[PDB]
Amino acid sequence: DIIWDQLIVKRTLADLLIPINRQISDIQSTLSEVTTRVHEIERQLHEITPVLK
Amino acid sequence: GDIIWDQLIVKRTLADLLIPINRQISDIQSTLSEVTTRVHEIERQLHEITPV
Amino acid sequence: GDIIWDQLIVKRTLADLLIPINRQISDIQSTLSEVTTRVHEIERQLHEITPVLKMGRTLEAISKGMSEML
């Protein structure tokens, strides 16, 4: 019927979109982690420029 | 034949819309890996001077 | 166009539903460009300050050491 056609169409799209969505979410989390590490480095560099003079 | 055909047409037209998405993602992944390596080297360098 | 007309309507529908993917990718690309710039500035700052710190520490070690000899 129409309700099973939707499920087959949906699963056919998912064969391609699930991996793109997975790749994007893993990039987003790694990029958020890197931004946090870079923020902490800027905080550390700020605390050690007083010792220069 | 009806549904198998429809799925193949739908899949193939989407797959080609994704070709540039896949290229963009692979280029992000390599740049992000390069940035993570540069940030790790900065953390090791900065640990050799962070005590007091 | 029988299946060619169907492919072009499906293609135009799918292209408009992929806009969130394009938006997500655009926003990743700009954030990644911004951190690469922040990472570049940190590398130049560590290059210029660390020879100053190692020398300033050496000079303090000589000054303390030699003031206590004399």
UniProtKB/Swiss-Prot annotation, chain B:
<comment type="subunit">
    <text>Homooligomer. Homomultimerization via the coiled coil domain is a prerequisite for binding to L. Found in a trimeric complex in which VP35 bridges L and the nucleoprotein. Interacts with NP. Disrupts innate immune signaling in infected host cell.</text>
</comment>
<comment type="similarity">
    <text>Belongs to the filoviridae polymerase cofactor VP35 family.</text>
</comment>
<feature type="coiled-coil region">
    <location>
        <begin position="12"/>
        <end position="52"/>
    </location>
</feature>
<comment type="function">
    <text>Plays an essential role in viral RNA synthesis and also a role in suppressing innate immune signaling.</text>
</comment>
<protein>
    <recommendedName>
        <fullName>Polymerase cofactor VP35</fullName>
    </recommendedName>
</protein>
Curated annotation (Swiss-Prot), chain C:
<protein>
    <recommendedName>
        <fullName>Polymerase cofactor VP35</fullName>
    </recommendedName>
</protein>
<comment type="subunit">
    <text>Homooligomer. Homomultimerization via the coiled coil domain is a prerequisite for binding to L. Found in a trimeric complex in which VP35 bridges L and the nucleoprotein. Interacts with NP. Disrupts innate immune signaling in infected host cell.</text>
</comment>
<feature type="coiled-coil region">
    <location>
        <begin position="12"/>
        <end position="62"/>
    </location>
</feature>
<comment type="function">
    <text>Plays an essential role in viral RNA synthesis and also a role in suppressing innate immune signaling.</text>
</comment>
<comment type="similarity">
    <text>Belongs to the filoviridae polymerase cofactor VP35 family.</text>
</comment>
